[PDB]
C-alpha cells in the first residue's frame, strides 16, 4: 500500500530536462560566468546540483528561498532589455571573481561607478514599465564596500541611498561598508534583491551610488518542476514524481521514502 523502492536516477522520458550543472538556479537571473548557457532556457524539469552557485562576486540573495521556489516551477525564463541609458558614470565595473576571459561581471547586471577615482556620483532616476502580459522578475543589487575609503574611491564621499518603487512596493536601501571574511579573495559583498512587476506597471530606481543596476528583466515561460539531486539522468525511464534520491515509480496511494518529493506523488507515510 506504500512504495519503498525508488529509482537511483532521474527519469527524464517525455519531459524537457535541464541539468543546471555548475550553475545555481538563481544565477540564471543575474548571470555569472557559469550561467551563460542558461541565461534563457525552457524546461519541464529543472535539476540543481550541489556544486552550482548563484554567485561569483561574494554575496547573498535577499529572500532567496522564496525566489528559488518561484524559479523551480517557471518552465524557464525569457529575458528582455530594460533599455537603461546612462551619462556621467563608468557603467562598466568588473571583478576578478566573475571571470570569463579576464575580469568581468554579471552578464545581466551592470556595476555603476563614478567616472574617476573619488569623483562624485550624481543622483539618477531610472524607470522601466512592464510592457508584456506576464509579470516581470526584476533584480537589483547593493554593493557593500570593504571600507569607507573604498566606497569613497568607487562612488564618491557622502551617504549613499538606493530606493526602489513600484505600484505595489516601495522601500529604500543603504550600503554597510566593512571588512568581512575572505570569500573568493574578497571582503566586499554584493547583495541582490528582487520583486515582481505587474503588467502596465513601472518600477523606478533612484540612487546615488553602491547600486548594481539591472540590464535585462526576466519573464516566466510556464510551469515546471524543480529538484536538487546527485543522481544520474535516465532518458528511457519515464516518471511522474521525483526527489533528491531519484524517481518514485508507483501506483500505490502512499510511500515512505522522502517527505518533500515534488510532482504527482503518493502521500507520505
Amino acid at each position: 500500500t506504500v512504495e519503498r523502492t525508488n529509482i537511483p536516477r532521474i527519469c527524464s522520458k517525455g519531459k524537457r530536462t535541464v541539468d543546471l550543472g555548475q550553475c545555481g538556479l538563481l544565477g540564471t537571473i543575474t548571470g555569472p560566468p557559469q550561467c551563460d548557457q542558461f541565461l534563457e532556457f525552457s524546461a519541464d524539469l529543472i535539476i540543481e546540483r550541489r556544486e552550482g552557485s548563484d554567485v561569483c562576486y561574494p554575496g547573498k540573495f535577499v529572500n532567496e528561498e522564496a525566489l528559488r521556489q518561484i524559479l523551480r516551477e517557471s518552465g524557464g525564463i525569457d529575458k528582455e532589455a530594460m533599455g537603461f541609458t546612462y551619462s556621467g558614470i563608468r557603467t562598466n565595473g568588473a571583478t576578478s571573481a566573475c571571470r570569463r576571459s579576464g575580469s568581468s561581471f554579471y552578464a545581466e547586471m551592470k556595476w555603476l561607478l563614478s567616472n574617476t577615482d573619488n569623483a562624485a556620483f550624481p543622483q539618477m532616476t531610472k524607470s522601466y514599465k512592464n510592457t508584456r502580459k506576464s509579470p516581470a522578475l526584476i533584480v537589483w543589487g547593493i554593493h557593500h564596500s570593504v571600507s569607507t575609503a573604498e566606497q569613497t574611491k568607487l562612488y564618491g564621499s557622502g551617504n549613499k541611498l538606493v530606493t526602489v518603487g513600484s505600484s505595489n512596493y516601495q522601500q529604500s536601501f543603504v550600503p554597510s561598508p566593512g571588512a568581512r571574511p575572505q570569500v573568493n579573495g574578497l571582503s566586499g559583498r554584493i547583495d541582490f534583491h528582487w520583486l515582481m512587476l505587474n503588467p502596465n506597471d513601472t518600477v523606478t530606481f533612484s540612487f546615488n551610488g553602491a547600486f548594481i543596476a539591472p540590464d535585462r528583466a526576466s519573464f516566466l515561460r510556464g510551469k515546471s518542476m524543480g529538484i536538487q539531486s546527485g543522481v544520474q539522468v535516465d532518458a528511457n525511464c519515464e516518471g511522474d514524481c521525483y526527489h533528491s534520491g531519484g524517481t518514485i515509480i508507483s501506483n500505490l496511494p502512499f510511500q515512505n521514502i522522502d517527505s518533500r518529493a515534488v510532482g504527482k506523488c503518493p502521500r507520505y507515510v
Epitope: 535577499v62 522564496a66 557622502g158 551617504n159 541611498l161 516601495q170 522601500q171 529604500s172 543603504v174 533612484s206
Partner: antibody, heavy 124, light 108 residues
Framework: QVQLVESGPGLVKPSQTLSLTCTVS??????????WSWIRQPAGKGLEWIGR???????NYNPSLKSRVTISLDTSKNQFSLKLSSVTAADTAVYYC????????????????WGKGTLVTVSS | DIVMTQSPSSLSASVGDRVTITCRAS??????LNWYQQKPGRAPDLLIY???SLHSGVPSRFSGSGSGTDFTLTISSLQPEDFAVYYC?????????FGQGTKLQIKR
C-alpha cells in the same frame, strides 16, 4: 545612545500649518543607517506613519498626507522638522519622533528610538 | 497599502498566564513584522523585530512566531507590569501600517 525630543506648539488653529521639531541627542543626524521618521497617534486610536527622511534629504510621505506634509532637516542644529499644512480637526493627535534603524544586515528595519510625544490639539 | 488585521482587541489574563496575540497581513512579506509595547502615557517601545528576533533589553518572556501572512506575539508567564497595548508593524514597504492594537488587561 541616541535620544529624540519633540519641541513644538501645543495647539494650532484650523486651516493652518502645524510645525514640530525633533532634537536628536547622543548621535549625529548624518548617520548612514537612520531614517528619521514621524508617527502620530489620535487619542484612543492607533498609530499612523506620517513620513521619514534620510540625511541626504530624500523623503517618503504617507500618500494620504503627502499633499499637506513637508519634512526637512537642519544638519547644523542636529534637528529635523515636520510641517502639516491646512490642519483640520482630525489632525489633533500625539506626534512622535522616531528613528528607523537600517543597521540590520538582513534588511529588516524597525523604530528603536522614540520621542516622548507631544500632543497637538487644534481649535479656535 | 498593506492592511494589518490584529486580533484580540482587548483581553484579560492572570499573572503567570501564557498570552498570545495574533497579527495577519493582506500580503506575504517574508516576516517584515515588528512588535511594540506601549504603556499608558508613553511612546511605544520595540519588543520584537523581524518577527522572531528579540530586541536587546526586553525580557526573555516575549516570543514571536510567524510565517508568510500570520504572526503571533506570545508572553509566557505574564507579569503585572506587562499591562499595555501591543501593536504589530509592517516593515516591508512604506507607507508603514500598524495593527489596531491589543489592550492587555490584568486579572487579579
Amino acid at each position: 545612545q541616541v535620544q529624540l525630543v519633540e519641541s513644538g506648539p501645543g495647539l494650532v488653529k484650523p486651516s493652518q500649518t502645524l510645525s514640530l521639531t525633533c532634537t536628536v541627542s547622543g548621535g549625529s543626524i548624518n548617520s548612514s543607517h537612520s531614517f528619521w521618521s514621524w508617527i502620530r497617534q489620535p487619542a484612543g486610536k492607533g498609530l499612523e506613519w506620517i513620513g521619514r527622511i534620510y540625511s541626504t534629504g530624500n523623503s517618503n510621505y504617507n500618500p494620504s498626507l503627502k499633499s499637506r506634509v513637508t519634512i526637512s532637516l537642519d544638519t547644523s542644529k542636529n534637528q529635523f522638522s515636520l510641517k502639516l499644512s491646512s490642519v483640520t480637526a482630525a489632525d489633533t493627535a500625539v506626534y512622535y519622533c522616531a528613528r528607523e534603524s537600517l543597521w540590520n544586515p538582513d534588511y529588516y528595519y524597525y523604530m528603536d528610538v522614540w520621542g516622548k510625544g507631544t500632543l497637538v490639539t487644534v481649535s479656535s | 497599502d498593506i492592511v494589518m488585521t490584529q486580533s484580540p482587541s482587548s483581553l484579560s489574563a492572570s499573572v503567570g498566564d501564557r498570552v498570545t496575540i495574533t497579527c495577519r497581513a493582506s500580503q506575504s512579506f517574508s516576516s517584515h513584522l515588528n512588535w511594540y509595547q506601549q504603556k499608558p502615557g508613553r511612546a511605544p517601545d520595540l519588543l520584537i523585530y523581524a518577527a522572531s528576533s528579540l530586541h536587546s533589553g526586553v525580557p526573555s518572556r516575549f516570543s514571536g512566531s510567524g510565517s508568510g501572512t500570520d504572526f503571533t506575539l506570545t508572553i509566557s508567564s505574564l507579569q503585572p507590569e506587562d499591562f499595555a497595548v501591543y501593536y504589530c508593524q509592517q516593515s516591508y514597504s512604506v507607507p508603514y501600517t500598524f495593527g489596531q492594537g491589543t489592550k492587555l488587561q490584568i486579572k487579579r
